[PDB]
């Protein structure tokens, strides 16, 4: 096992920073602050971060560096009875690949669309517009903004699809963009972390160059301080309501991606004695710091929109793809040198996503390269075949009704699947492997054991932190619908199978090899709870 290693430590730090910092840092965190009491939201956000997020983030980083294997092999060597956890985590990463990159394609599509003297999404008098178009965002459902109609009627053409059944034609301009992202991903994850860890230099750092420019541009706009007000002004009344605590908890969990399989894979290439504790604290902070900085970039322009462009703050302080593809471009198209802002903004969105794609794909490539040597020998071939399956199936999301299909995956691919997977990860680590056996492994790496704080969080808070999410996530459940469309009950089932195809691997694999070893019930519940290294 002469495993290779990051050519430099910045390769690892930027790879981790890059995987963590993505569009969610821009189109969800600032919105949650504005919605849940401004500055006061940082109280439950920081608590959930210190008590649930960073612990789990730290845990997987240490496991990866210590056990020095991908997700499948790692959990197998940790507790065999739960080797299925590694399979669930790899399958979930596989599913989210089918839709995460098409959002990067949208960014390139808008990027190539900004090479013009006047941006197309500015006015309401184009072939794609309707008589109900209006210049900027409003609050009546049947009257979209110019930028909304451009995104909807020209880029997506979603208006020509009656639902998930009616997909329609394949927009080959989107398919070309999707290919350009898989080509970029290929010659990046091409020959391992040797080049991967270098491409991450541009993709992980470039967003801070643009955030810096847009931050100055935004704070120097009439009314930007008004935006900073809607962003932060405290209202600690929100702290009392439990909806903001589950909001903070959920955002913290999904923004760090602890136990998703990629932090494991990335850490497994570190040197055994790397101070992975200093790494977990450093990168986890840089992640939340980037969200905070981004909120100023967004709401500085949001206030400008509400003060000079005359719109209601509630009509533009949105979240999700609508914020970056409709609301913000609209404001960009209204300021001097708009072509410049549009070009670097859409380029930022692209590089924000690429990093996170790399991480999800590496989680798969590494996990398989460590469990089936046929793949490790032919790396360039495997990913070539993987991305091809991605692109080909991805053409179903370059269709006109692709959003309906893509929206389905978003709510089912990893939504509850990853939560129950990480719950077992925490249960396995602390209770079946052992926190003392785990703390002992960390002592051998960094020279000191984790404090009792980190041990208490891995053993009791992390499982409660994750149930607190899954419980309130099931309580707020409602059938799948986008705008007026109600998904048919067969689609609602298709998602549950996607959700179950990963989670079932846990009990399924626990049943298969629970019968594949010889001996008594207890004699086998112990041959399958003895770690691999405790065998030499």
């Amino acid at each position: 096992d002469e495993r290779e290693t990051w050519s430099g430590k910045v390769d690892f730090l930027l790879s981790v920073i890059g995987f963590a910092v993505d569009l969610a840092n821009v189109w969800r965190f600032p919105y949650l602050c504005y919605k849940n009491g401004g500055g006061a939201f940082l109280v439950p956000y920081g608590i959930m971060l210190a008590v649930g997020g960073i612990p789990l983030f730290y845990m997987e980083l240490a496991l990866g560096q210590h056990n020095r294997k991908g997700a499948i092999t790692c959990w197998g060597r940790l507790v065999p009875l739960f080797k299925g956890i590694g399979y669930a985590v790899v399958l979930i990463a596989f599913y989210v690949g089918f839709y995460y990159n098409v959002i990067i394609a949208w960014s390139l599509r808008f990027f190539f669309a900004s090479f013009t003297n006047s941006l197309p999404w500015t006015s309401c008098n184009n072939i794609w517009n309707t008589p109900n178009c209006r210049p900027f965002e409003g609050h009546v459902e049947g009257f979209q903004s110019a930028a909304s109609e451009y995104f909807n009627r020209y880029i997506l053409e979603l208006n020509r699809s009656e639902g998930i059944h009616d997909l329609g034609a394949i927009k080959w301009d989107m398919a070309l963009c999707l290919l350009i992202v898989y080509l970029i991903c290929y010659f990046s994850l091409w020959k391992g972390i040797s080049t991967s860890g270098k491409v991450v230099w541009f993709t992980a750092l470039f967003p801070y160059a643009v955030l810096l420019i847009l931050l100055i541009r935004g704070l120097t706009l009439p009314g930007s301080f008004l935006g900073i007000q809607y962003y932060l002004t405290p209202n600690f009344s929100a702290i009392y309501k439990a909806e903001v605590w589950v909001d903070a908890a959920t955002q913290v969990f999904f923004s760090l991606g602890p136990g998703f399989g990629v932090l494991l894979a990335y850490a497994s290439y570190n040197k055994y004695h790397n101070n992975v504790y200093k790494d977990a604290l450093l990168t986890s902070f840089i992640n939340s710091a980037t969200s905070f900085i981004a909120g100023f970039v967004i709401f500085s322009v949001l206030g400008y929109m509400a003060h000079t462009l005359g719109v209601r703050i509630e009509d533009v302080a949105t979240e999700g793809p609508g914020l970056v593809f409709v609301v913000y471009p609209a404001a960009i198209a209204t300021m001097p040198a708009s072509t410049f802002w549009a070009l670097i903004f859409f380029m930022m969105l692209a590089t924000l996503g690429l990093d996170s794609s790399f991480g999800g794909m590496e989680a798969i490539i590494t996990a398989l390269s460590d469990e089936f040597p046929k793949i490790k020998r032919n790396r360039e071939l495997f990913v070539a075949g993987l991305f091809s399956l991605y692109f080909v199936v991805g053409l179903a999301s370059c269709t006109q009704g692709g959003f309906y299909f893509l929206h389905l995956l978003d709510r089912y691919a990893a939504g509850y699947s990853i939560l129950v997977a990480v719950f077992f990860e925490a249960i396995a680590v602390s209770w079946i492997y052992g926190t003392n056996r785990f703390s002992e492994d960390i002592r051998d790496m960094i020279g000191f054991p984790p404090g009792r704080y980190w041990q208490v969080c891995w053993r009791f808070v992390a499982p409660i932190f994750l149930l607190f999410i899954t419980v309130y996530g099931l309580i707020g459940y409602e059938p799948l619908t986008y705008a007026d469309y109600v998904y048919p009950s067969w689609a609602n089932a298709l998602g549950w199978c996607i959700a179950g195809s990963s989670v079932v691997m846990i009990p399924a694999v626990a049943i298969f090899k629970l019968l594949s070893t010889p001996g008594s019930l207890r004699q086998r519940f112990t041959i399958l709870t003895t770690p691999w290294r405790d065998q030499q």
Partner: antibody
Amino acid sequence: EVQLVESGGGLVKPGGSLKLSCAASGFTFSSYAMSWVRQSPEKRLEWVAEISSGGRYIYYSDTVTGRFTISRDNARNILHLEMSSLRSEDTAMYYCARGEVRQRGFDYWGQGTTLTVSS
Amino acid sequence: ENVLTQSPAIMSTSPGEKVTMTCRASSSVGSSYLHWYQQKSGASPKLWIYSTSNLASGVPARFSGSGSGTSYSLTISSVEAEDAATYYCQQFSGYPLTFGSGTKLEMKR
């Protein structure tokens, strides 16, 4: 409050074998790595072996590897050192030292137990 | 093996004077891993300074530490008779763990 007591060990003929013991009291023995450090009659400190908190990580000095075996009993809070094929060079006072955190060092030492290897 | 050499081997001092002793390693040692032990004639060693500069519990303030890389030093501000002992440095950053050759501090009369 913390106490370490070495015991066993006296005169042994070359090639022979002997077993040292260290009694721990005043702390959660199972939470701390332990090491043996010996001091030759020429008063030179030399580290010999270390065993981790749960005994799953063990390091030996090159000059002792293959002949000494360090072991642990977290149930009874005892540290052992099994020595075989001894030589006169092994003559020394053997210390039992607590050292969980590499960045803090050996924060507690025993009174020592003397091994004389001679024909 | 990282051999640590201490100088001087013996050194006399009259109470009140300032004493400095050096610990030179044959390979770079992380400052956070260099430690110092005091051993009185007839007793067992006692942890004295850890991470180059931190005094152990019970160590009076007249003791200080400093250094980095391959050169470290223990320094007594105003030496007292209760300081007569042998001082061993030690590195905890690489196996095998290695102690310095020691500096014996004797009193001048």
